Amino acid sequence: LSTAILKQKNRPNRLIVDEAINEDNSVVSLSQPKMDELQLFRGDTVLLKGKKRREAVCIVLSDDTCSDEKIRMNRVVRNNLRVRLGDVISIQPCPDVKYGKRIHVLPIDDTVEGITGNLFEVYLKPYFLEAYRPIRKGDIFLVHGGMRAVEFKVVETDPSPYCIVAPDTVIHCEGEPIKREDEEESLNEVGYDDIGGCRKQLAQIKEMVELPLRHPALFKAIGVKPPRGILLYGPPGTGKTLIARAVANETGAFFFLINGPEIMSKLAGESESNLRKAFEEAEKNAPAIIFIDELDAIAPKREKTHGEVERRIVSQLLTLMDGLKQRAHVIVMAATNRPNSIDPALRRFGRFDREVDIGIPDATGRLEILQIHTKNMKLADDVDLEQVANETHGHVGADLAALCSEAALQAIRKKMDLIDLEDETIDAEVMNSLAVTMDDFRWALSQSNPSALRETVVEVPQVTWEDIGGLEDVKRELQELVQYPVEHPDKFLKFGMTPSKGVLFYGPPGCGKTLLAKAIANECQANFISIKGPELLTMWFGESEANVREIFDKARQAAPCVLFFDELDSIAKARGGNIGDGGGAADRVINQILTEMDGMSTKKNVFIIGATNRPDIIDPAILRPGRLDQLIYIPLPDEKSRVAILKANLRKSPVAKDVDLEFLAKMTNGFSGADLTEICQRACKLAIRESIESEIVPEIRRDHFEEAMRFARRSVSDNDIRKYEMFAQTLQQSRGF
Amino acid sequence: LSTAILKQKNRPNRLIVDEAINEDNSVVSLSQPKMDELQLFRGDTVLLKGKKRREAVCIVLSDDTCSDEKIRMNRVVRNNLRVRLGDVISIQPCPDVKYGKRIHVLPIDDTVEGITGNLFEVYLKPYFLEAYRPIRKGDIFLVHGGMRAVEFKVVETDPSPYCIVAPDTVIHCEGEPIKREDEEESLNEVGYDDIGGCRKQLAQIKEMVELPLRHPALFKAIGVKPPRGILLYGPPGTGKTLIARAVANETGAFFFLINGPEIMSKLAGESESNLRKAFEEAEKNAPAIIFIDELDAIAPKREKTHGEVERRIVSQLLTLMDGLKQRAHVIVMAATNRPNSIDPALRRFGRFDREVDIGIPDATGRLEILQIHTKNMKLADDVDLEQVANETHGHVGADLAALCSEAALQAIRKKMDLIDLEDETIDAEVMNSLAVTMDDFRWALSQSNPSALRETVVEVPQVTWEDIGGLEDVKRELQELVQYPVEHPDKFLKFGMTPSKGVLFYGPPGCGKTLLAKAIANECQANFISIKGPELLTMWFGESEANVREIFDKARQAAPCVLFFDELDSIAKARGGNIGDGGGAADRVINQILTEMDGMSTKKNVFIIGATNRPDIIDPAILRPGRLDQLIYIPLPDEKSRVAILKANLRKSPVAKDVDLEFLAKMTNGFSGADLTEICQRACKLAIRESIESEIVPEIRRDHFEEAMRFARRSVSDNDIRKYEMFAQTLQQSRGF
Ligand SMILES: Nc1ncnc2c1ncn2[C@@H]1O[C@H](COP(=O)(O)OP(=O)(O)OP(O)(O)=S)[C@@H](O)[C@H]1O
Ligand SMILES: Nc1ncnc2c1ncn2[C@@H]1O[C@H](COP(=O)(O)OP(=O)(O)OP(O)(O)=S)[C@@H](O)[C@H]1O
Ligand SMILES: Nc1ncnc2c1ncn2[C@@H]1O[C@H](COP(=O)(O)OP(=O)(O)OP(O)(O)=S)[C@@H](O)[C@H]1O
Ligand SMILES: Nc1ncnc2c1ncn2[C@@H]1O[C@H](COP(=O)(O)OP(=O)(O)OP(O)(O)=S)[C@@H](O)[C@H]1O
Ligand SMILES: [Mg+2]
Ligand SMILES: [Mg+2]
Ligand SMILES: [Mg+2]
Ligand SMILES: [Mg+2]
């Protein structure tokens, strides 16, 4: 529903297109139910406006040879106003056009080859009947008389659209022939199809920028105020400038790009003139978008800036934003990788109220980025882009572009024996065979250093219930506590009881506390933010009191979310618990945590889960009803659940049929899930060593597990068993004394 | 009494108005007891000056068809100088007016439709008898001869008020016809009726700005000094600029708006000239208001500023404020969202002595904001604005405007199938059916991120005595301790004993310490500030020694107030109590608390309540007679009070008649109120799960409570019972050793 602006299904005005049995660009295919169903008379030349402000023209009425009804062109339009199937192109006539001047010869490379003579009677004499060359700026067509392999481009025209040429016109002979790079920048221009992994953010940008500008009457009639300040933020390299470049040519509004450093590079006084002229030029054209890339470069915080020119620039920008009234229809867009460094006076109502978060893409998002970036390369048949997307975790769009570049370079290194640096040229038999293979991508992955490794990942974890053995009661309770209020809120307000927002996991280590938190988020298809104990202790010593703010509201914007606080014992160990260092477990950090969970409304879908291995040193303040009142105990797996844990851990391992998992389950009494995983890993290491030794078979046999069972260490002692058991019944007693 | 300037009841010069049986704008209704009761002779044309500096004119003496005595017009004046019923419009004649020039034709859209010819004999020939078109700048009237559906506006006039036109006048033909947006900004101009939730602050602003300016003689005769500096402060987006815009057109004084960033955006030297010219222009006109929006932008603290131009600006502003003597009648108003960032030299006597606090509106306040903002939209019939106001808690006026915008956008997204982006227009059958429904508002509420969530809410809590089970003795004591000195202060000075200002709540956790503090504030209709333990520990580590100042005086200005200090054990746990970390519970923070409660006068209505679950680790210094000498013990609920607690918790739940609450009360011996609430919540979860399972009935039955009673955990142990009991008698012994 939120991305409804990007949906094109169930449209009766669209159809599928197939291959063409003919190979002639001069012909077009028509249909009776697409031409005789309206009032389009038999015109001479009609325009065909597709996407990216590009149109095309050909000879109409060139059909009644192939099938009717459905429409189908050749494959030459694969690079002309088309990138994929399923596009609706609005066809509309344009009669009563004016008459323009003529255009002289504009050769490219047709003089140093063959004979030329005059080069005038090969494109104007044979094509003058009912066709006066409806040329336009951006039209590419093939016309000649010697080999039919050269194109021609026009730059001389009085109006913007096409026109009918007329003879007997004087042309000033000062036209310089163009090079190749001037037109090669145009076809590969950035569009909406070059953005990968930002489907959700693109819908928001379209509905708050393009919609208020193309249809201001819709927003005016409904009595609403269209937002005039949009701030794109995210980690560096996520594609903020790419969206700017995409909307700079995919929108029918006057675009004005303002670079951050470019403004700040000017002298004192000359920079404010640039901002004033930019806003004045935008105000002149009613459809207008202003993009201020690198907003943090020109608008830092006025309480920690140094120079006076920066403060004057910030005040000038604030005045310019406030001075835009309603009738101008000017939308100011900005992009920064440091949204917290923006002056707070700018992220206020009426200036930059709207904020779009371009976060790190997930595996599905980055697969699309890889496909977009490799769409112009030549891959082999063994490349698996899904595998590359899965392996990359902290990678952003820039990181994926760098990875593709490194993979391409690795392919070049492999063919250095054939290429000669001292040679004037290199054979074409090795261009066409130069393909990037999967081993090239693996090598690039081996030393790709991602730039978003430290960033908190907000995604849906891949850990399902299948990865967790046993613990059915905990699964049912977690479902009834998280999945229930998010799918059936009507059952909760009827009974008048607010859902409990908060669960604490406690028990012996290595029992599935992290797996349960990830699985409950995976089943509900909700976001999951995992913040560990030591991560909070490191993140605060830099005297940053607001470092829990951007992680608590990060969950809030990603609703529904599961905010997991793993390894709380590490935090609690920093103060000793009851007496410790004099102060309780309520040290500098968790007090912020309690303040933040107290401030979150109960109607929100953000769920908070905490896990600890040391329930004796958690402060009682976190158990208060309203924060983490739900105390779910995670016991050691028993006879029945150990078989399930082993089966879950051995799902990806070729275990032979003779392995009796029940016997190993019954032999290990006080073994946690981590101990069983360690047993399986030791068995696999034994199998790997056996295979390597026997190389100078690829199945885990009974003896492999028998040998690994000998060294199996128990992680939880008998005394810890009784302590955890007596603590599973008296944890809520911690509040009071 | 404080808002007496906004009261209009018991006025004999007012009456109610009903609908009109006639539909003719050219007629007006008169009455004998409203026309023959004064000395108004039978004039030709009389003005009718309403509100917002707007007046209207029509043909007088057009009655004696409908009923007399009472007055009633048509519904066409619903947008002309009227927004609601109950308005008194001062009627006064204006004879001996001068004669002005003429006005040429000012067409709008009457040339591209129909026939025009001359367009002169359709508004001047048929209307010249005893009516010379008393036109004025801002008059809208309907006059034509073809369809009577076009209006006309004048801009050409020599004087300000209306005049009698005279023929044979030469007009310079240079008048450019006006567009639509130039007049569309005027009717929707901000007025006093566009302010929601600031009824109290508007009365203060009117009585310290409009009153001293409209009637300086009243202030001079009484021998008082009218304040000449008003500072509006509050959280961002609360409506400070909106009040500026409202007083800019609702007051009969020369308004001069000074923007903060607009001054600071000028060059060195040019900014001071702007301030000097602004003050000079204000001094020229005796009724004058100067508004300095974003005062913190131009007047930061001189001890932590960086540039010299800022210091020069601050000194110039100080000199300009001090240079205003008494006879100028110039009132300087300022608005900032950071009142603590203002230079302290400016918030002194004679400069900005008066301060008006525009805080976050309550539910009633924000309901009015929602009504004001949706007054121009088209809602459905299922929308409940009271529900939206109740659900929004940390929302301010800007947040509510954004929520309304998001709700309107959600409505547009639902109708994307009918609207066509490629179409040149869209059908009018979907404008009129485009209504925002309640589910649209629910979706907008699901991800509205309020900007005032961290702000300390100062409101009257909704927790009444009905929400608290039992504890009648504590209720009576709290009444006799808080409600008594605030309603009957005469009974206290007679006996000569000062009321005890301070109560400490101690006892086992989950017994109603927070509920009692909220209920005692709700019954007395007093404000309530809840500051928790961890909130104080987080709020101080940023090395902010003045962070308890703005919360203690916040209670002082909101008198009567109940300053609640909940979860004091979390504060006391930060030092260990008796020995702990060597220091006692008197750490960095509570020493400020004791200093602040020592400084508050006993005649104030601010009441301080503290609550703790660990009375063994509170320092004795807080129990000193004069701070929290009243030690109210909150015991565990007994047989009799548990039934009341269950009834209070089950007031909003459909419990069946077969549930015997006395039996569950007698079965749970050492159960706190939180334990009973948890039992009820578990029973409701069981009922919800049963209903969901049976879906593939909506009443809590006996078995639901029987099952939930099995897992009911006791929160307070037997040892804690005896410790709390022995501590309930010897808490005052803590002072001394
Ligand atoms: N979603 C994406 N889809 C496709 N290509 C992408 C995407 N994100 C990034 N890229 C590529 O990576 C490059 C990184 O540039 P940008 O991310 O646009 O720069 P930026 O977003 O302004 O971040 P900075 O420069 O560090 S502040 C882009 O120019 C693209 O080539
Ligand atoms: N119930 C289980 N089913 C399957 N594997 C499990 C289970 N419990 C633990 N494991 C294994 O043990 C690893 C650690 O799981 P965690 O959820 O992190 O345990 P924990 O209770 O959080 O304690 P630690 O301190 O994190 S080891 C998992 O990655 C699994 O390999
Ligand atoms: N009480 C209110 N009644 C009606 N509309 C309101 C109210 N408060 C805010 N608004 C709306 O929300 C917008 C917020 O703008 P303002 O609050 O006036 O700006 P501000 O008060 O100067 O706060 P800043 O700009 O963050 S310092 C207003 O323009 C109104 O549209
Ligand atoms: N007397 C009571 N009547 C009804 N509900 C109660 C009562 N006492 C406690 N509760 C419930 O328990 C919850 C907690 O109430 P509080 O006043 O916060 O208890 P407390 O004494 O302050 O101890 P904590 O640490 O806050 S749980 C309330 O929201 C109610 O749901
Ligand atoms: Mg950029
Ligand atoms: Mg873990
Ligand atoms: Mg303002
Ligand atoms: Mg409490």
Residue numbers in the entry:
A (entry chain A), B (entry chain B): 12 to 707, 728 to 768
From the paper:
The human AAA+ ATPase p97, also known as valosin-containing protein, a potential target for cancer therapeutics, plays a vital role in the clearing of misfolded proteins. p97 dysfunction is also known to play a crucial role in several neurodegenerative disorders, such as MultiSystem Proteinopathy 1 (MSP-1) and Familial Amyotrophic Lateral Sclerosis (ALS). pmcp97 is a member of the classic clade of AAA+ ATPases and is an essential cellular enzyme. p97 is composed of six protomers forming a homo-hexamer with an N-terminal domain (NTD) and two tandem ATPase domains D1 and D2 (1). p97 is an essential protein in regulating cellular homeostasis from membrane fusion, Endoplasmic Reticulum-Associated Degradation, Mitochondrial-Associated Degradation (MAD), Chromatin-Associated Degradation to NF-κB activation (2). Critical functions for p97 include the translocation and restructuring of proteins from large cellular structures such as organelle membranes and extraction of ubiquitinated client proteins to facilitate their degradation through the ubiquitin-proteasome system. Here, we present cryo-EM structural analyses of four disease mutants p97R155H, p97R191Q, p97A232E, p97D592N, as well as p97E470D, implicated in resistance to the drug CB-5083, a potent p97 inhibitor.
Despite varying degrees of differences in the ADP-bound state as compared with p97WT, all three mutants display essentially similar structures when the D1 and D2 domains are bound to ATPγS and in the state corresponding to conformation III of p97WT. This is not surprising since R155, R191, and A232 are all exposed to solvent in conformation III, i.e., no longer interacting at the N-D1 interface; therefore the mutations at these sites are not expected to affect the quaternary conformation significantly. The effect of the ATPγS-driven conformational change is especially noteworthy in the case of the p97R155H mutant because the upward movement of the N-domain results in the displacement of R155 by ∼25 Å to a solvent exposed face of the protein, away from the N-D1 interface. In the ATPγS-bound state, p97R155H and other N-D1 mutants with similar phenotypes may have an effect on cofactor or substrate binding since it is in close proximity to the site where cofactors are expected to interact with p97 (22). Indeed, the p97R155H mutant has been found to have altered responses relative to p97WT when bound to either p47 or p37 cofactors.
